Amino acid sequence: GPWSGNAVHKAEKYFITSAKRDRDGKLQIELVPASGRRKLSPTPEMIRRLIDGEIEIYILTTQPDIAIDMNKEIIDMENRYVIDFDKRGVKWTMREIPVF
Amino acid sequence: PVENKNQAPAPGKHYFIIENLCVGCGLCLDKCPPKVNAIGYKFYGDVQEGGFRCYIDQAACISCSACFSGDECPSGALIEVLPDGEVLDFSYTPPERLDFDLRFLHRFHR
Amino acid sequence: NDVTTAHSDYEIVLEGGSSSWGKVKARAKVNAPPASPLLPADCDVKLNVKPLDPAKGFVRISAVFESIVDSTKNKLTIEADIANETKERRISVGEGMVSVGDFSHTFSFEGSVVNLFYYRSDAVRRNVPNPIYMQGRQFHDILMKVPLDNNDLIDTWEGTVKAIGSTGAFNDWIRDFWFIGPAFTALNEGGQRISRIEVNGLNTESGPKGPVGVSRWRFSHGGSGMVDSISRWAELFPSDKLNRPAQVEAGFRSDSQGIEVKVDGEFPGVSVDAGGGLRRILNHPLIPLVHHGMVGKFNNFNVDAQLKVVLPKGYKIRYAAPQYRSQNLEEYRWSGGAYARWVEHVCKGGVGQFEILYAQ
Amino acid sequence: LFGSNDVTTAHSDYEIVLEGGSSSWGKVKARAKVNAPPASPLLPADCDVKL
Amino acid sequence: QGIEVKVDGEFPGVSVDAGGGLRRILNHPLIPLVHHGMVGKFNNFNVDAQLK
Amino acid sequence: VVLPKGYKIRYAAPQYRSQNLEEYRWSGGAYARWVEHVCKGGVGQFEILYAQ
Amino acid sequence: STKWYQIFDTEKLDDEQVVGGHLALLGVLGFIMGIYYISGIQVFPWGAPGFHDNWFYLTIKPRMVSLGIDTYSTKTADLEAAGARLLGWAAFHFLVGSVLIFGGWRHWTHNLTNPFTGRCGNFRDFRFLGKFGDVVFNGTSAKSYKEALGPHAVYMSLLFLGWGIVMWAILGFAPIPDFQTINSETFMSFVFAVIFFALGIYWWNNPPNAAIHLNDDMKAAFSVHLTAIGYINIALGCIAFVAFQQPSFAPYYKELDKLVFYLYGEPFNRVSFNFVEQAKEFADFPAYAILPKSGEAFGMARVVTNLIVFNHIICGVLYVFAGVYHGGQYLLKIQLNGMYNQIKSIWITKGRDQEVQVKILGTVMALCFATMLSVYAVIVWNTICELNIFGTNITMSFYWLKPLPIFQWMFADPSINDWVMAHVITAGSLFSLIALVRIAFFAHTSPLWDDLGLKKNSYSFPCLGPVYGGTCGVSIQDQLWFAMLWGIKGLSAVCWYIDGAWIASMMYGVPAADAKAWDSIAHLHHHYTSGIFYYFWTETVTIFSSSHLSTILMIGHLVWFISFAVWFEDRGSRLEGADIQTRTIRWLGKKFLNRDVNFRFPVLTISDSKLAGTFLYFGGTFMLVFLFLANGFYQTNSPLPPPVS
Numbered sequence A: 001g002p003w004s005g006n007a008v009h010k011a012e013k014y015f016i017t018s019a020k021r022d023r024d025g026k027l028q029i030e031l032v033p034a035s036g037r038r039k040l041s042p043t044p045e046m047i048r049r050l051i052d053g054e055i056e057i058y059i060l061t062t063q064p065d066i067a068i069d070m071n072k073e074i075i076d077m078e079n080r081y082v083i084d085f086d087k088r089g090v091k092w093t094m095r096e097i098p099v100f
Numbered sequence B: 001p002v003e004n005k006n007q008a009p010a011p012g013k014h015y016f017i018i019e020n021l022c023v024g025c026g027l028c029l030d031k032c033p034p035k036v037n038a039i040g041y042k043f044y045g046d047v048q049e050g051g052f053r054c055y056i057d058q059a060a061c062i063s064c065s066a067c068f069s070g071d072e073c074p075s076g077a078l079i080e081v082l083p084d085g086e087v088l089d090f091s092y093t094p095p096e097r098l099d100f101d102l103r104f105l106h107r108f109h110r
Numbered sequence C: 001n002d003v004t005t006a007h008s009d010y011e012i013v014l015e016g017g018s019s020s021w022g023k024v025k026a027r028a029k030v031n032a033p034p035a036s037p038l039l040p041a042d043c044d045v046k047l048n049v050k051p052l053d054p055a056k057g058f059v060r061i062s063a064v065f066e067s068i069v070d071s072t073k074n075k076l077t078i079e080a081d082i083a084n085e086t087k088e089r090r091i092s093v094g095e096g097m098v099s100v101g102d103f104s105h106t107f108s109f110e111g112s113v114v115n116l117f118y119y120r121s122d123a124v125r126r127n128v129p130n131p132i133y134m135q136g137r138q139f140h141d142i143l144m145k146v147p148l149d150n151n152d153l154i155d156t157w158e159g160t161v162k163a164i165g166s167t168g169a170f171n172d173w174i175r176d177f178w179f180i181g182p183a184f185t186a187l188n189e190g191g192q193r194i195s196r197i198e199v200n201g202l203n204t205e206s207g208p209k210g211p212v213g214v215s216r217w218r219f220s221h222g223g224s225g226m227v228d229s230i231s232r233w234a235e236l237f238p239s240d241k242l243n244r245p246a247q248v249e250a251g252f253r254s255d256s257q258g259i260e261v262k263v264d265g266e267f268p269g270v271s272v273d274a275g276g277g278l279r280r281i282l283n284h285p286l287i288p289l290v291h292h293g294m295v296g297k298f299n300n301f302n303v304d305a306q307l308k309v310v311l312p313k314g315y316k317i318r319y320a321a322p323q324y325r326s327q328n329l330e331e332y333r334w335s336g337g338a339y340a341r342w343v344e345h346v347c348k349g350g351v352g353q354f355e356i357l358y359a360q
Numbered sequence D: 001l002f003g004s005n006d007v008t009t010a011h012s013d014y015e016i017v018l019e020g021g022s023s024s025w026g027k028v029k030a031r032a033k034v035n036a037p038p039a040s041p042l043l044p045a046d047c048d049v050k051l
Numbered sequence E: 001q002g003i004e005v006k007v008d009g010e011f012p013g014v015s016v017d018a019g020g021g022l023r024r025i026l027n028h029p030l031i032p033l034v035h036h037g038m039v040g041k042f043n044n045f046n047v048d049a050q051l052k
Numbered sequence F: 001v002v003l004p005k006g007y008k009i010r011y012a013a014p015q016y017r018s019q020n021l022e023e024y025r026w027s028g029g030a031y032a033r034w035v036e037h038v039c040k041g042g043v044g045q046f047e048i049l050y051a052q
Numbered sequence G: 001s002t003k004w005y006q007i008f009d010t011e012k013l014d015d016e017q018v019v020g021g022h023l024a025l026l027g028v029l030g031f032i033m034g035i036y037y038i039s040g041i042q043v044f045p046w047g048a049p050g051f052h053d054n055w056f057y058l059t060i061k062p063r064m065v066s067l068g069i070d071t072y073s074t075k076t077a078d079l080e081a082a083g084a085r086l087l088g089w090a091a092f093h094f095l096v097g098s099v100l101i102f103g104g105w106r107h108w109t110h111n112l113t114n115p116f117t118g119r120c121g122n123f124r125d126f127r128f129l130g131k132f133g134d135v136v137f138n139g140t141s142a143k144s145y146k147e148a149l150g151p152h153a154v155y156m157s158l159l160f161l162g163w164g165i166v167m168w169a170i171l172g173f174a175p176i177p178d179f180q181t182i183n184s185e186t187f188m189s190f191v192f193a194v195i196f197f198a199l200g201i202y203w204w205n206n207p208p209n210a211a212i213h214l215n216d217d218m219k220a221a222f223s224v225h226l227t228a229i230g231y232i233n234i235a236l237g238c239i240a241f242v243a244f245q246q247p248s249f250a251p252y253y254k255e256l257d258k259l260v261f262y263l264y265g266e267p268f269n270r271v272s273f274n275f276v277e278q279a280k281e282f283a284d285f286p287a288y289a290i291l292p293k294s295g296e297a298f299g300m301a302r303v304v305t306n307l308i309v310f311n312h313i314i315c316g317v318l319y320v321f322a323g324v325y326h327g328g329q330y331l332l333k334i335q336l337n338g339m340y341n342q343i344k345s346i347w348i349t350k351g352r353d354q355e356v357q358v359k360i361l362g363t364v365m366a367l368c369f370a371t372m373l374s375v376y377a378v379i380v381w382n383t384i385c386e387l388n389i390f391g392t393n394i395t396m397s398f399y400w401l402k403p404l405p406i407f408q409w410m411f412a413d414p415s416i417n418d419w420v421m422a423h424v425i426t427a428g429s430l431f432s433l434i435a436l437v438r439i440a441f442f443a444h445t446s447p448l449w450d451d452l453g454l455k456k457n458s459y460s461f462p463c464l465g466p467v468y469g470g471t472c473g474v475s476i477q478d479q480l481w482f483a484m485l486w487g488i489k490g491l492s493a494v495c496w497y498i499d500g501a502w503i504a505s506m507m508y509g510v511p512a513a514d515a516k517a518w519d520s521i522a523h524l525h526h527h528y529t530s531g532i533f534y535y536f537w538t539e540t541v542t543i544f545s546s547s548h549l550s551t552i553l554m555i556g557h558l559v560w561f562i563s564f565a566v567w568f569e570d571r572g573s574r575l576e577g578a579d580i581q582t583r584t585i586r587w588l589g590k591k592f593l594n595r596d597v598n599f600r601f602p603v604l605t606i607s608d609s610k611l612a613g614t615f616l617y618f619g620g621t622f623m624l625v626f627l628f629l630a631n632g633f634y635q636t637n638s639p640l641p642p643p644v645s
């Protein structure tokens, strides 16, 4: 179980690259697993996996913010973004360079 | 009859760190050359509750890749972005496997 | 005396940087008899590639097959210019000479190979990180000219003229002629299906010193994914990666007592970026594996194999399957164990993978 | 002495529980562990089939 | 390094009636055997097999 | 192999193990290798040439 | 990070390299054995005295007596014959060891050329001998460890047959099946030669398959063989303790008590401040000469038996711990490499499921806790009753608790002491097994580190920081150190039991009343030397009497409380202190040096600090336990009377 795949992640960690908001919304939002060999698209089957809990997609910070107000605009702590508006999504924070 | 000659001796970059995932162990600091000093501790609160994390100064950090190639991160916060944009928690993650156990009926493990 | 064992040494010296440009040195000896009704069977093959012009993209390849079978010497030399016109269509202009015994004929050829994959889905390439089985079809169109400078050769051309003009089923039996003997089996064991050919032209114009027979013909190789020529067409032709004249010598001598093989040579394309930042030593082409298993299944053997992958400094192997036994801090060594089982696997026709992933 | 050394090992168990009478039903439970390498060009292959 | 196969099943066509009042376990389909033969001849092996 | 009288084996794929007058016997290692070769489908030769 | 203890790591060594190392070690061991044999020459063949009874030779001696060497003779001529045989066999060992070192160097250089015949012998393919190799194997094991077990067993059979031959010809022991007398070890050597030849040919024709080791044999096979041979060494220690106590070995061990020894460092006759050698206590012996120590009072038979038994026992326990640690290192390697999911064998697949690991470790922990609590409560209650605090006499103690009559066969005098010894051994075994199982299963991720998203990425990483207020010592190396510290208690129990001590109570034999009445109420014909705490007081009498043992005492104590400095959580304090030291050493500038002091004061890494701490901890502890076993047996077969009738 844990030894299969990356041992840190309970669910498959799918980071979201900065594919965004450059051509009719850029529906081909780039989802990349922790393995990183493949580069998938956000098809409804990936959403089925994500709601199944087997995978979990995460937004990074140090990049052009990915449709940050067009995907979802809940900004209570700036990290309340959800895809199907009832997702309970989690954002990865990186104040890498802006902090001392 | 005739054959040709043979010889055969065989026989006889822009690395980032996710502070949400980072736990503040600082092996990146040990893996960084002292002349650069890219890895640095940032303190948030009580040390025993996670407290300080680590950060990279992008301008100072110039494509050494020692941190990630060392593969010393326990938390997987040390990430590498690629020119095409893929992100790597680890250099080589083990493959995901469909796990289900084996029990022979007549063997002693049944 | 009853024990048959295979002794093999392998050395893969990769070079630093994005370009692989690796050197392969392989020695092999096996006590099992060869699967050849003509013995002894000795062969020397020299393949040298030279960059004719990087701006034009033209490369030049010379292959010299020298062989001795049953005390008879055969020699197929061929110099050719390969040029990648498009990612599907490729052109070739070359000249060569086949000298068997006292007989010898020189040939010239213009040839267009159009390789089209059946499925160009972005879904497959998006999901699968390592595409192995890629179906497709290669259309070869070859115009080959041979001086009819020999009476027996003239007889061959005349008889072939009548054969083409007499039988309408010739396009099916020409495959039987072309796939002489076990070759016709091998194409079925490797997923290769060959369509009936189409003879566009069959004519003769005469040069001042002798007549020239010109034959233009097309055929359609068809790969069901297992074929290296189709599935690895891009990995086939690393012309962009080639700036230095590369070359490989390969000689195998087959007496009934044993088989001795030596393959020494450098060439590009050994390692390709598999994604995820790890360079992979290229996947094994499966056509060699199955075609060699065809003859390797015929006998059992003990395995004594040793592979020595010489990484360039600063690079480390992150994945090996099976694991390396010993490491010299730059050279990774696979000797015995599950590597021996994998060597048995591939000798007998196994298409199992040996993932060597290495990175900075 | 013997030939064809350095062989791998495969351990297999099978059970066919038949049903009496006109019922031709059976319960097949099979297990196998083979130490030979697989013939998969993409080797790490695990498939579960629920029919 | 290996292959690990586990089959649990309940099949309604295991037993086939034969002449003379005899019933038998069904003849093995040959496509499985032959299609397994391609991969089964790739290594030399010894089998420890039990059947109940 | 029993030849016609007055003939001898000159060239041979792996040589004869034993030779009585007029009788040649192939056995041992290499001939067994060839037999194992042809049992499994090997098309290798066993070129036995005999001359007066 | 390749350290000075990683240069000889197996990952950099090949099969031929380790063959050469093993042969060099065998030759060096032969040279050391020659040293010891020379050290056992009591009277020189020249016509002069000899060496003063080294502990090494005092251990080696009874085995030599079993052979035709080393007569237990006070007669000078026969003792000179003993010295002659010892010296001759030492020279033979020297020659054979020199040849073995030469072969080891040849295999280390991968330069195998025979001087007489200019040919190169391939390590991968050869014949074992000119005709014998073709008779048996017809070739070589094809570079796979599983295929080598056959030839290895054949070589062991050859060695057994050679040992029988040597006993038959040189040492003059004719094989007969009488196992009470010495001259059956050669008959059993021949029997073992037959048995192991059969096993070797079977394993050559049919190689056993545990495909885990073959790939990275350098660590997997190393770990498996090391743990197996550690258990073998523990079994050998147990067998040695049983046998050396048997009457059959008595002519070769009890006679060691009959004869006296002049040991190196044993107290000498003390001269006064004014001894005119042109006052001296014990004037019959010469000045500054070693006073004889009588074996009967010293119990030299059981002292040598204890040295042998505990040497093998602790070596076996250490080998078990190292096997588990190296197996954990290999498991971590395959876990980072992704091969952990691909092993396909029972020795891994059973532990692949983390819940099975949890169940196994929880069962071990529960058994350890239950047994430890039971035995410790028994011990402390016995101590309370014998010291009579809270108004409890020893009638309330666990004196009734004897081993079961069915289980009483394996004890001399059934008592609570044997019960507590067995329970303490089981409890300590499970106590160390907790950490051994942690190494085995949690090399990469513990269930806590599965829940909390961290993973162990190295065999020698210090920790993961102060996150969660912890993370200290989760490396398999640190778990090995904890396992060693936990097994220190078990090894101490073993040593104290074999030396003779009341483990069932703490202060047995002290001037308290019910401590002395233990023997009266227990009905024991053996008077155990003393209780756990009183053991030091009773057995340091000789350690203080002997200057050499006192020197060892001091050095071991220094080593231990120097281990303290690197064991504690103080590495950062030591680093800043070392920076202050460096700054003041730079302040030696302007002290008229004119020399740039480029000397940074070094402080060990935590992964190195724990290494040094455990090494010094174990070293001091068991340098002192050597004195425990070298104080003497001092067990008198006389029950104690009650202080009050």
Ligand code: BCL
Binding pocket: C047, C048, C049, C061, C062, C063, C078, C080, C081, C082, C083, C090, C091, C092, C094, C110, C111, C112, C113, C140, C141, C142, C178, C221, C229, C236, C237, C246, C247, C248, C266, C267
């Ligand atoms: C082998 C499996 C396929 C095949 C697949 C390919 C591939 C693949 C290529 C061609 C190409 C060519 N094919 Mg074709 N082709 C086959 C059968 C044929 C037949 C025939 C009647 O048998 C003919 C007449 C042709 C005709 C031709 C030419 C038009 C053209 C150049 C040949 C040349 O230079 O060879 C010179 C002779 C050789 C070099 C001899 C050795 C050939 C082997 C296959 C080389 C293996 C290289 C080795 C693994 C690594 C070497 C390292 C060295 C440094 C280079 N093909 C079969 C059906 N064909 C090329 C092209 O597209 O041209 C436009 C090309 O890329």
Ligand code: BCL
Binding pocket: C024, C045, C046, C047, C049, C059, C060, C061, C082, C228, C229, C232, C235, C236, C237, C238, C239, C242, C246, C248, C249, C250, C263, C267, C268, C269, C270, C282, C283, C284, C285
């Ligand atoms: C005319 C032939 C074709 C062609 C056909 C093929 C085929 C088909 C294959 C390759 C393969 C390879 N080719 Mg090519 N290739 C062509 C052009 C090139 C050129 C070039 C710029 O001219 C170069 C540098 C290469 C280089 C390479 C490598 C990237 C790769 C082998 C990897 C390895 O480690 O091999 C290890 C090296 C060897 C074992 C040495 C072999 C040496 C012998 C003399 C040649 C093979 C003989 C063969 C068994 C028998 C041929 C008999 C026929 C009757 C002619 N090719 C030409 C145009 N090449 C393989 C690969 O993986 O493709 C992705 C593959 O399947």
Ligand code: BCL
Binding pocket: G008, G009, G010, G013, G017, G018, G019, G020, G021, G022, G024, G025, G217, G218, G219, G220, G221, G222, G223, G225, G226, G229, G315, G318
């Ligand atoms: C009971 C027999 C044991 C055993 C007992 C020993 C002993 C004892 C020694 C070795 C040594 C080594 N063994 Mg071992 N070893 C066993 C099984 C194995 C297996 C296996 C089955 O897979 C392997 C691959 C090895 C491999 C190795 C290497 C790490 C090394 C020899 C090669 C070299 O040149 O070293 C290069 C270096 C040298 C040969 C000498 C370096 C200098 C000194 C002599 C090292 C001493 C270390 C230490 C103090 C030994 C103490 C033993 C304790 C007192 C109990 N061992 C069996 C089961 N092995 C030696 C080694 O170096 O240990 C680290 C060593 O000391």
Ligand code: BCL
Binding pocket: G019, G023, G099, G100, G102, G103, G104, G106, G111, G112, G113, G114, G115, G119, G120, G121, G122, G123, G125, G126, G127, G128, G129, G130
């Ligand atoms: C000091 C004794 C050392 C030793 C010292 C040497 C020396 C010195 C040399 C070799 C040579 C060789 N050694 Mg050695 N070697 C030892 C044990 C081993 C073992 C093992 C059994 O584990 C292996 C795998 C090897 C490997 C090898 C061979 C590849 C090679 C001989 C080729 C052959 O056909 O020779 C046939 C015979 C062998 C395989 C010998 C096997 C080992 C025997 C037990 C000892 C031989 C040397 C000894 C002093 C002579 C008397 C032996 C008694 C009659 C038993 N050695 C023993 C323990 N070995 C020789 C060489 O390279 O030859 C060309 C060489 O010069």
Ligand code: BCL
Binding pocket: G026, G027, G029, G030, G031, G033, G060, G061, G063, G064, G067, G089, G093, G096, G097, G100, G155, G156, G157, G159, G160, G163, G166, G189, G232, G236
């Ligand atoms: C081997 C490395 C060193 C060496 C180091 C030692 C050591 C260390 C010791 C001796 C001791 C002995 N040595 Mg020496 N000695 C060497 C070379 C030799 C040679 C020789 C020609 O090679 C000979 C004849 C001897 C002779 C002897 C005897 C005088 C004496 C008792 C042997 C005996 O009981 O073995 C018993 C023989 C066997 C059991 C059979 C052969 C070995 C088998 C095949 C291996 C398994 C058994 C193993 C030893 C124990 C493991 C038991 C487990 C249950 C598996 N030495 C080389 C140079 N020697 C002993 C000593 O002095 O005792 C006080 C002793 O302990």
Ligand code: BCL
Binding pocket: G210, G212, G213, G219, G220, G221, G223, G224, G227, G228, G229, G231, G320, G323, G324, G326, G327, G328, G330, G331, G346, G347, G348, G349, G350, G351, G352, G433, G436, G437, G439, G440, G441
């Ligand atoms: C029994 C013979 C050997 C043995 C042979 C092997 C072999 C062979 C392998 C290991 C390997 C390992 N060994 Mg071991 N090992 C033994 C003793 C030990 C002890 C110990 C103190 O008892 C420990 C803690 C270890 C530790 C370890 C681990 C590092 C690793 C297994 C991890 C795993 O997931 O296990 C999962 C746990 C199990 C499968 C436990 C169950 C064991 C068996 C298979 C089932 C029947 C036994 C039953 C439970 C107990 C009662 C009957 C017994 C006969 C007494 N070994 C003894 C000395 N060990 C493997 C490794 O990778 O090495 C580097 C490996 O290849």
Ligand code: G2O
Binding pocket: G558, G561, G562, G564, G565, G566, G568, G570, G573, G574, G575, G576, G577, G578, G581
């Ligand atoms: C014999 C035993 C010990 C020493 C010898 C010693 C030496 C020493 N140590 Mg120590 N130590 C413990 C025992 C010993 N620590 C214990 C049991 C603990 C557990 C709590 C412990 C813990 C800490 C912490 C946390 C810190 C230190 C330091 C610090 C020093 C810096 C300068 C100084 O204090 O000199 C004062 C000390 C000296 C005069 C020591 C040198 C001769 C000596 C008189 C006796 C000589 C003994 C001989 C060297 C042994 C072998 C000889 C031969 C075989 C080679 C420094 C010389 C630290 C600093 O660098 O600053 C202080 C720091 O932060 N410690």
Ligand code: SF4
Binding pocket: B015, B031, B032, B033, B036, B037, B038, B039, B056, B060, B061, B062, B063, B064, B065, B066, B067, B068
């Ligand atoms: S990549 Fe180089 S500069 Fe950047 S943090 Fe790592 S070691 Fe420092």
Ligand code: SF4
Binding pocket: B017, B022, B023, B024, B025, B026, B027, B028, B054, B072, B073, B074, B075, B076, B077, B078
């Ligand atoms: S190694 Fe990982 S956990 Fe440690 S400081 Fe670096 S990013 Fe943080």
Ligand SMILES: [Ca+2]
Binding pocket: G499, G539, G627, G628, G629, G630, G631, G632, G633
């Ligand atoms: Ca004592």
